[PDB]
Structure 1
Amino acid sequence: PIVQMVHQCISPRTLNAWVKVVEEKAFSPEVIPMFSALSCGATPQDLNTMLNTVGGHQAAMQMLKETINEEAAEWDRLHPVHIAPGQMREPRGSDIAGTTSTLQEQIGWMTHNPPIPVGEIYKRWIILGLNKIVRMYSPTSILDIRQGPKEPFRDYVDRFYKTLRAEQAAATETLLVQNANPDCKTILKALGPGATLEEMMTACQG
């Protein structure tokens, strides 16, 4: 990454943390924030390093390459560029993705005045592709998350919003009630409209 504005080597802890997150959690949605936090201050070279250290899930990694190329093409459309000697150049899509730019070029853009934040732009493209992958690898739809006959209400709400988080990559208490089991459904409808989640779960912890 880069820090203070000086480039810093990616740490063995950060590298291992990421590889382990991917090994342990695959593309569950909570992997996306960790990546963003682990890639705090990352140059594009560092981001490519992090992606490449993942050994498995190579289908997902190919899809990710596709999404990155879609964003790079849209970048070339939105901010077309032409260089003068002794002066730096403006980055195009393949430059933000680190395939045609050097480390020094990335550092120059990221620490220039005004700064051109190629690391954040690349990270946004990467998270866009990751969100697509998380949504795709979601095992079941939100319409199919229904409370079982003896399933504790808390566990059902856990499943409901975990699925919603994967599928949103809103505040559907109506589907939540509709998909609750009959006893809980009767109680929740009698609770009234505008009931918060705490109220719904307290009403149904029996």
Structure 2
Amino acid sequence: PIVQNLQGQMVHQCISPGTLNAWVKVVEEKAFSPEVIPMFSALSCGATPQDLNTMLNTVGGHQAAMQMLKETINEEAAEWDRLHPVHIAPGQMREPRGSDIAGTTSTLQEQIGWMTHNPPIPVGEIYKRWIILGLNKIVRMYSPTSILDIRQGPKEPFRDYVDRFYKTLRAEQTLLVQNANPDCKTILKALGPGATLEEMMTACQ
């Protein structure tokens, strides 16, 4: 990544073993559960495009997912090129293309130069945006259950049903009452409109 040193200047730092292992392990343990994406963003704090490719490329499984991610990246790269066309002068900074932002046709030194320029061109942040767009698509696709099929069981605790409900909703990206069981539904209808989730959970506890 690029970080501020002890004296304030922006400089490159190697991606740590800790960071590398943390990402690989969370993918192994959580697959494409929605919470993996906030973890990805935090672990890639200050990342260059090289760092972002490292993280994605260190993943061993899920190659269907990783190929879909490349497609999304290539769509975002193409749209960047459509909005930001480029036409170099000796010792001067060239303008980044889509593939340069994706770390494919740019060197680490060039990425550092764009990221630390004044004004800066935040190629790590632009690429992470594209990557997260792609990851969100995968999270949605690999969501195993529709929200329409999350219904409260006859003796399922309401808290457990609401957990299942908002877990599914998060992945998929009124109905809570409708999908409740008969006993809690009668209690929830009695509360009337504008009841908070807290109030609903308290009532069916």
- Normalised TM-score (structure 2): 0.96
For residues 171-199 of structure 1, give each alpha carbon's deviation from its aligned partner in whole angstroms, at most 9, with x where no partner exists.
xxx00000000111010010110000000
What is the DSSP-based 3-state SS (H/G/I as helix, E as strand, rest coil) of the residue aligned with 2:91?
Answer: coil
CA apart distance, 1:126? 0.3
Q: What do you get for the CA RMSD once the two structures are aligned?
A: 0.6
What is the DSSP-based 3-state SS (H/G/I as helix, E as strand, rest coil) of the residue aligned with 1:88?
Answer: coil
Determine the C-alpha separation between the residues in 2 that align with 1:88 and 1:151.
62
CA apart distance, 1:85? 1.4
Determine the C-alpha separation between the residues in 2 that align with 1:167 and 1:151.
23
Runs of 4 or more consecutive aligned structure 1 residues displaced over 2 Å after TM superposition: none
Determine the C-alpha separation between the residues in 2 that align with 1:41 and 1:167.
29
Q: After alignment, is 80-89 or 42-51 more displaced? A: 80-89
| Seq. identity, % | 100
CA apart distance, 1:84? 1.4
What is the DSSP-based 3-state SS (H/G/I as helix, E as strand, rest coil) of the residue aligned with 2:152?
Answer: coil
Determine the C-alpha separation between the residues in 2 that align with 1:51 and 1:109.
22
Determine the C-alpha separation between the residues in 2 that align with 1:183 and 1:85.
76
CA apart distance, 1:83? 1.6
Determine the C-alpha separation between the residues in 1 that align with 2:97 and 2:131.
16
For residues 6-61 of structure 1, give each alpha carbon's deviation from its aligned partner in whole angstroms, at most 9, with x where no partner exists.
10000000000000000000000000000000000000001100001000001100
What is the DSSP-based 3-state SS (H/G/I as helix, E as strand, rest coil) of the residue aligned with 2:81?
Answer: helix
For residues 48-83 of structure 1, give each alpha carbon's deviation from its aligned partner in whole angstroms, at most 9, with x where no partner exists.
000010000011000000000000001011111112
Determine the C-alpha separation between the residues in 1 that align with 2:59 and 2:73.
17
Determine the C-alpha separation between the residues in 1 that align with 2:182 and 2:85.
59
For residues 131-186 of structure 1, give each alpha carbon's deviation from its aligned partner in whole angstroms, at most 9, with x where no partner exists.
00000000000111110111100010001101110011xxxxx0000000011101
Determine the C-alpha separation between the residues in 1 that align with 2:136 and 2:200.
30
Determine the C-alpha separation between the residues in 1 that align with 2:130 and 2:145.
26
CA apart distance, 1:102? 0.3
- Normalised TM-score (structure 1): 0.96
Aligned residues: 200
Determine the C-alpha separation between the residues in 1 that align with 2:49 and 2:86.
19
Determine the C-alpha separation between the residues in 2 that align with 1:148 and 1:79.
54
User: 5+ residue gaps in structure 2?
Assistant: 4-8
Aligned to 1:200: 200
User: 5+ residue gaps in structure 1?
Assistant: 169-173
CA apart distance, 1:86? 1.6
Determine the C-alpha separation between the residues in 1 that align with 2:188 and 2:46.
47
Aligned to 1:171: none
What is the DSSP-based 3-state SS (H/G/I as helix, E as strand, rest coil) of the residue aligned with 1:6?
Answer: strand
Q: Say if 2:69 is the partner of 1:64.
A: yes
What is the DSSP-based 3-state SS (H/G/I as helix, E as strand, rest coil) of the residue aligned with 1:177?
Answer: helix
